[PDB]
């Protein structure tokens, strides 16, 4: 879903 990191989810 929406992780606070670069490669897991866009930069969410």
| Cα 2–Cα 8–Cα 12 angle in degrees, nearest 5 | 35
Residue linked to tokens 């606070």: 4
Cα R_g (the chain), whole angstroms:
5
Q: Is 1 helix (H, G, I), strand (E, B) or coil?
A: coil
Taken in order 11, 4, 2, 8, the sign of the CA dihedral is positive
């Amino acid at each position: 879903g929406c992780c606070s990191d670069k490669r897991c989810a866009w930069r969410c």
